[PDB]
Amino acid sequence: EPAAAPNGISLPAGYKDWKMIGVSSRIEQNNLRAILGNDIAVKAAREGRTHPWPDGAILVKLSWKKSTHELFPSAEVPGDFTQADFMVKDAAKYASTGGWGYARWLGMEQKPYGANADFAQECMGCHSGAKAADYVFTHPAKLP
Amino acid sequence: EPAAAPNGISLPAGYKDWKMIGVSSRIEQNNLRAILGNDIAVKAAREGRTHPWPDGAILVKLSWKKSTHELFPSAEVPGDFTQADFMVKDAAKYASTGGWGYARWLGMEQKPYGANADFAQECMGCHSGAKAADYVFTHPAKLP
Ligand SMILES: [Fe+3]
Ligand SMILES: [Fe+3]
Structure with missing residues (x-):
């Protein structure tokens, strides 16, 4: 089992089996990404219950080199x-990081990112730009 | 419900809940794609059982404008x-098109593509280029 992130979040088991929320390509990173979520997240995303996301919602972004x-x-x-980035919604428990627990694991070897338990302030530095959208950039992709 | 493709293939129900196989960006179309599969496809993808893909495997490529x-x-x-493209493996039924049933539905309106029952020859035009990989271009994305 991979080590926990430095803020105590364990790697969500089974995330490769989750349903798709979107895809993206980050120009500046030369990365392709898939955004998946647990069933709480996917229900929310599809029903538009994202203001805020519900407790228990987990989003995962998987990144590969182009x-x-x-x-x-x-x-x-x-x-x-290259990495798996997670956001776990728990409004009470991660109230200091905006109601989300952030965590990243690097590579196939899945080394937890972060020098210490405050690594998530780095995440917040960018994600606060999406504060109006509950710190989540991704818009769920349109499907019929 | 959407109409069946001209070759008789019905839209697979619940494809939006399928597991991921990969993602891609097609430079010459300015699109982003997600490649999902039914559980037979996903199990084959993950186990490398792609020479050939087993009967019953269904791959879907969902495309959005960037x-x-x-x-x-x-x-x-x-x-x-913009479109949902499907490949349904049945080595006997679809022997004339490389053992794959091709089908495409266009837009949010899910209009079947193709002028007639022979429309799949178009798909084979390019997909024949991947004959060494059982007509499938996608390489499953590697996850831990
Ligand atoms: Fe981020
Ligand atoms: Fe194709």
């Missing part, structure tokens, strides 16, 4: 897995 | 939904 497909150079496809 | 996040411009994020 490569190009060997048979189809215009297709940018995942290569190396 | 948009830029209003709060973070270097993040390309899904805009409008």
Whole structure:
């Protein structure tokens, strides 16, 4: 089992089996990302209950290096897995980080990120830009 | 319910709840895609049972136009939904098209694509390029 994050959050088991909320590509990072969520999160996302997200909602963003497909150079496809970023909603328990518990695990080896238990202030530094949207940038992708 | 594709393939129910296989960005279309699969596909993907894919495997590629996040411009994020493309493995039934049943539904309106029952030959036009990988371009994204 991977080590916990320095703020005590354990790696959510089973996140590879979760349903999709969106996808993204970060230009500046040369990364492709999938955004998944547990069933609490997915229900919320689909029903628009995101002001705030419900307690128990977990979002995960999975990041891979962009490569190009060997048979189809215009297709940018995942290569190396770089990290898994989580946000766990618990309004009471993480009230100091805006009601979310942040945690990141690096690579296939899944080393928990962060020098100490205050690493999540780094997350907050950017995520506070989405404070109006409960610190979540992702808009759930449209599906019929 | 959406109409069946011209070759008789019905839209698979609950595809939006399928597990992820991968993601991609197609430079020449300015889209983002999510590649999901039914549980047969996902089990095959994860175990490397892709030479060939087993009968019953269904892959779906969901496509959105690329948009830029209003709060973070270097993040390309899904805009409008443009199409759902499906490949249904049945080596006997779809022997004429490489053992795969192809089908595409367009837009939020889920209009079946194709002029007639032979529309899949278009798909085979490019997919034949991936014949060494059982006509599947996608390489499952690697996760821990
Ligand atoms: Fe973030
Ligand atoms: Fe295709």
